[PDB]
Amino acid sequence: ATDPNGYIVFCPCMGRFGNQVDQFLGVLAFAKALDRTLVLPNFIEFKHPETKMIPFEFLFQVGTVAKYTRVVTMQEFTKKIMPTVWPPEKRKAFCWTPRQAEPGCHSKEGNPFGPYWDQIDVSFVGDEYFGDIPGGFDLNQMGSRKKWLEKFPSEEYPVLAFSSAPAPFPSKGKVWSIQKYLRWSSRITEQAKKFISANLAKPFVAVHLRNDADWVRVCEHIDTTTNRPLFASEQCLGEGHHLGTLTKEICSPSKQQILEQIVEKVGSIGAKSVFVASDKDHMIDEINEALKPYEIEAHRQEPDDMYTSLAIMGRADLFVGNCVSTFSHIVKRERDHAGQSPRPSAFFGI
Amino acid sequence: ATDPNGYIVFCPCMGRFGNQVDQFLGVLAFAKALDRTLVLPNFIEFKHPETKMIPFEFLFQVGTVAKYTRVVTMQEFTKKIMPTVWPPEKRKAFCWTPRQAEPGCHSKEGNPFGPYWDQIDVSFVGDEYFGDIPGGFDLNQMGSRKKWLEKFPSEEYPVLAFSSAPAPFPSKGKVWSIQKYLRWSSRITEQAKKFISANLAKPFVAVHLRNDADWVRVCEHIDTTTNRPLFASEQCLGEGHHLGTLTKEICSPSKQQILEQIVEKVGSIGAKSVFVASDKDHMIDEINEALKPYEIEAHRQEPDDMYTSLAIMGRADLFVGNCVSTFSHIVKRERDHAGQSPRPSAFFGI
Numbered sequence: 001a002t003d004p005n006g007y008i009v010f011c012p013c014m015g016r017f018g019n020q021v022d023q024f025l026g027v028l029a030f031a032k033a034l035d036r037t038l039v040l041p042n043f044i045e046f047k048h049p050e051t052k053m054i055p056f057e058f059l060f061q062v063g064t065v066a067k068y069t070r071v072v073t074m075q076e077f078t079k080k081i082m083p084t085v086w087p088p089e090k091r092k093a094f095c096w097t098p099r100q101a102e103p104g105c106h107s108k109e110g111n112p113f114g115p116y117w118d119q120i121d122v123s124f125v126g127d128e129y130f131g132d133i134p135g136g137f138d139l140n141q142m143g144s145r146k147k148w149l150e151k152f153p154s155e156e157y158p159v160l161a162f163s164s165a166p167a168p169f170p171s172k173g174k175v176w177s178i179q180k181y182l183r184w185s186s187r188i189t190e191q192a193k194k195f196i197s198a199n200l201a202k203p204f205v206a207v208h209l210r211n212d213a214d215w216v217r218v219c220e221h222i223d224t225t226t227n228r229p230l231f232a233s234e235q236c237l238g239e240g241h242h243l244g245t246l247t248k249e250i251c252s253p254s255k256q257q258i259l260e261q262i263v264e265k266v267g268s269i270g271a272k273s274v275f276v277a278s279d280k281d282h283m284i285d286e287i288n289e290a291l292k293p294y295e296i297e298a299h300r301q302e303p304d305d306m307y308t309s310l311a312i313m314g315r316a317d318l319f320v321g322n323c324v325s326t327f328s329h330i331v332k333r334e335r336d337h338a339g340q341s342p343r344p345s346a347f348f349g350i
Numbered sequence: 351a352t353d354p355n356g357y358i359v360f361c362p363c364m365g366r367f368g369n370q371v372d373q374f375l376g377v378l379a380f381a382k383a384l385d386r387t388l389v390l391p392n393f394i395e396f397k398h399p400e401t402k403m404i405p406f407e408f409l410f411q412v413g414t415v416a417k418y419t420r421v422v423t424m425q426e427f428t429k430k431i432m433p434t435v436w437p438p439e440k441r442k443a444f445c446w447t448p449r450q451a452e453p454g455c456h457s458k459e460g461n462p463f464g465p466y467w468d469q470i471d472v473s474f475v476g477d478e479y480f481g482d483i484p485g486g487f488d489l490n491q492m493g494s495r496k497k498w499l500e501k502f503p504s505e506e507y508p509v510l511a512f513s514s515a516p517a518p519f520p521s522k523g524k525v526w527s528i529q530k531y532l533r534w535s536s537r538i539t540e541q542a543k544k545f546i547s548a549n550l551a552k553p554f555v556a557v558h559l560r561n562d563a564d565w566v567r568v569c570e571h572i573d574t575t576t577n578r579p580l581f582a583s584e585q586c587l588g589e590g591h592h593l594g595t596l597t598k599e600i601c602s603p604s605k606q607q608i609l610e611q612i613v614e615k616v617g618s619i620g621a622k623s624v625f626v627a628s629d630k631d632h633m634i635d636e637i638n639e640a641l642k643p644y645e646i647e648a649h650r651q652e653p654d655d656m657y658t659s660l661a662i663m664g665r666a667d668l669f670v671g672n673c674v675s676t677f678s679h680i681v682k683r684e685r686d687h688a689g690q691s692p693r694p695s696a697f698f699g700i
C-alpha cells in the first residue's frame with residue numbers, strides 16, 4: 001500500500017555534503033513530528049562539469065535510518081508511489097512565503113534547484129506557503145504539528161515538496177543525535193576497514209584539514225566582536241558560542257599549529273599512524289617530517305574520496321577536526337552518537 | 351540627536367506598488383513593536399528602462415505616518431544619521447537564514463535588490479539571522495520583542511537592515527487599519543481634487559480595471575479546489591477565504607460583466623459620472639456606450655498616473671475594485687480607515 005499520512009520530499013539544495021547532511025538531520029525530525037514518510041534525498045556533488053545527484057542508499061543504509069522514522073528511497077517514490085499518489089497536476093511546491101523571482105516559491109530557479117527536480121522529472125504547477133503557521137517548521141518546542149495537519153490534510157496534500165530543506169541551518173543541538181541513524185553503506189564501510197587494515201597501524205589519529213582558498217576567505221571574514229555561529233562552530237563552542245570566541249586560528253590553523261597539535265595528539269595516545277583527510281593540502285610530507293621522532297607516518301587516500309574519508313575518521317582512535325566545518329561535524333556527531341558511548345574527538349585551536 | 355534604540359531600514363523588494371505598500375504596513379507595525387525608528391522606504395517603479403526609486407515623501411505625508419510610530423526620511427537617514435551611527439564597516443544585512451546564492455543573505459543579488467541599496471550607496475560586509483528567534487517577525491501575538499532586543503541590542507546593532515521587508519505578504523487583517531496613516535502628499539491630493547472638479551460630476555463611481563496580459567495569466571491559474579489566498583483576495587473573501595471561493599470571474603471579470611456591474615452601481619447611487627483606473631484597457635468607449643441610457647460618461651487620466659488614480663478612487667462616492675489586486679486593496683483600506691467612518695466599496699464578481 002502507501003502511507004495514508006502522505007509524504008515529504010525535499011532538495012538538500014544548500015551547500016556541499018556537510019550542509020546537506022546537517023539539514024537532513026532536521027528534516028528527519030520534522031517528518032517524524034508530522035508523522036509523514038520521508039522520501040530519502042539524493043545528495044548533491046558539485047566537483048564535476050555538472051551537478052551530480054547521488055542516491056541516499058549509495059552512501060547510507062536505509063535499514064538504519066528507518067529505525068528512526070518511516071522512509072522510502074527516491075527510486076521507490078518515483079517509480080512506485082509518485083505516479084498514482086502525486087500526479088504532475090498536483091505537484092505543488094512548498095515554501096515559507098511568496099518571493100521575488102510572479103511572486104511564488106520559484107523551486108527550479110538556479111542550481112542545484114533545477115537539476116535536482118529535473119533528475120526526478122518533477123515540475124511544479126502551484127505553490128503552497130507555511131510561513132503563516134505559528135512556529136514554522138520547528139515542531140518540538142514551539143510545537144505546531146496540529147496546525148500543519150489542519151492546513152495540509154493528507155488527502156488533499158499527499159506529498160509535501162520543499163525546494164529548500166525544512167530544517168534549520170546550522171543544525172540545532174537537539175537533532176545532532178539523529179546522526180546515530182546514518183550508518184555508511186556496506187560498500188563504504190568495507191573500503192574504510194580495508195584502508196585502515198592496510199595502512200593505519202593502531203591506535204591512529206585522524207585529522208580533517210580544511211584548507212582550500214574559499215575556506216581561508218571565509219575564516220578571514222570572522223567578526224570576533226559579534227561572535228555569531230559560523231557553520232558548525234557551535235560543535236566546539238556551544239550553542240550561541242557560550243563557551244568562547246571563534247577565532248581565525250580555530251577556523252584556519254596555521255601549518256605550524258597543525259603540526260604542533262598533530263604531534264601533541266600522537267604523543268598523548270601513543271599513536272602508530274596518522275590519517276589525513278583534506279579538501280586540498282594533505283600536508284603529507286610536512287606531517288611526516290614532524291612525525292620522524294615517533295617513527296610513524298601520515299597517510300591519505302589517493303584520490304581523496306570524501307565519503308570513505310568521513311567513514312575512516314569515524315573509526316579512528318582519536319579524531320581531530322575543524323570546528324567550523326560541517327564536514328568535521330559529521331564525524332564529531334557519528335563519533336558522539338553511533339555507538340553506546342562517545343569515541344573521543346578534539347578540534348584544532350581548541 | 352539620534353534614536354538610542356536604533357533604526358530599521360529595508361527594501362520593499364517584492365512586487366509592484368500594491369505589494370510594496372502591503373508589506374510596508376507590516377513593517378510599520380514591526381518597527382513600532384521593536385521601538386526602533388523606521389527609515390521610510392523608497393518605493394520602486396518598474397515601468398521605465400531601468401528600475402526607479404521614489405522617495406516616500408513624494409507620495410505620502412511624513413507628518414501623518416509619524417503619528418503611528420517614529421520615522422525618518424531616507425534623505426535624513428543617509429545624509430545625517432548613517433555616516434556616524436552606521437558606517438560602511440558595520441553594515442550587516444539581516445535575513446531569516448543563510449541561503450544558497452557562500453551561504454548568506456545575498457542582499458544585492460538581482461533586481462530590485464541591487465539597484466535599491468546602490469541608490470543609497472550601501473553595501474553589506476556581514477550577515478545576521480533572525481530565523482532562530484521564537485515567533486519570527488510576528489511581534490504581536492507570538493510576541494518576541496524581548497528576544498529581538500536581547501539578540502540585537504541597540505549599541506551593537508544601531509541599524510537593522512533587511513533586504514526583504516520584515517512583514518508578511520499578503521498582509522494580515524490586523525495591519526490593514528495602518529492605512530489610516532498613509533495620507534497622499536499635498537501634490538497628489540491636489541491633482542486628485544482638480545481632476546474630480548473638472549471631470550467628475552458627483553456622486554461618482556470609481557472602478558479599478560486590472561486587465562493586462564500577465565494578470566489574465568495569474569487569474570487563469572486559480573486552483574478552485576485548494577482555494578488559497580491569492581494576493582489581496584482576503585479583502586473580499588475574509589481571512590483564509592472563510593466567506594467563499596475565489597473564482598476566475600472575480601479575479602478577471604469579462605467585459606460584459608464589468609459593464610453590467612458598472613451600470614448596476616451607477617443606477618444604485620444615481621451616479622453622475624464614472625472614473626476608470628486601468629493598467630491597460632480603460633474601456634472608455636464601451637463603458638460610454640453602456641452609460642448612454644443614463645446620459646453620463648466614464649473618464650480617465652491621460653496618461654494614467656497610478657498614484658493620482660489611487661487618490662481619486664479613495665475620494666469616490668463609490669469604489670468598485672478588483673478583489674485580487676493589492677492595488678485595489680490600497681483603496682479599500684483607505685476607504686475603510688482614512689476617516690472616522692468607512693466610505694463604501696464593492697468588488698467585481700462579489
Ligand SMILES: C[C@@H]1O[C@H](OP(=O)(O)OP(=O)(O)OC[C@H]2O[C@@H](n3cnc4c(=O)[nH]c(N)nc43)[C@H](O)[C@@H]2O)[C@@H](O)[C@H](O)[C@@H]1O
Nearest residue numbers: 015016017018019218231277278279304305306325326327
Ligand atoms: C565556505 C563554506 O564551506 C562549507 O563547507 P564545510 O562546512 O567544510 O563542509 P561541506 O558542506 O561538506 O563543504 C565542504 C566540501 O568540500 C570538500 N571537502 C572538505 N573536506 C574534505 C575532505 O577532507 N576530503 C575530501 N575529499 N573533500 C573534502 C567536500 O566536497 C565537502 O563536501 C560549505 O558547505 C558552505 O556552503 C561554504 O562553501
Ligand SMILES: C[C@@H]1O[C@H](OP(=O)(O)OP(=O)(O)OC[C@H]2O[C@@H](n3cnc4c(=O)[nH]c(N)nc43)[C@H](O)[C@@H]2O)[C@@H](O)[C@H](O)[C@@H]1O
Nearest residue numbers: 365366367368369568581627628629654655656675676677
Ligand atoms: C501578477 C501579480 O500582480 C500584482 O499586482 P497587483 O496586486 O494588482 O498590484 P501592484 O503590486 O500594484 O502591481 C500592479 C501594478 O500595475 C500597474 N497598475 C495596476 N493598476 C493600475 C491602474 O489602475 N493604473 C495605473 N496607472 N497602473 C496600474 C501599477 O504599476 C501597479 O503598481 C503584482 O504586484 C504581483 O507582483 C504580480 O505581478
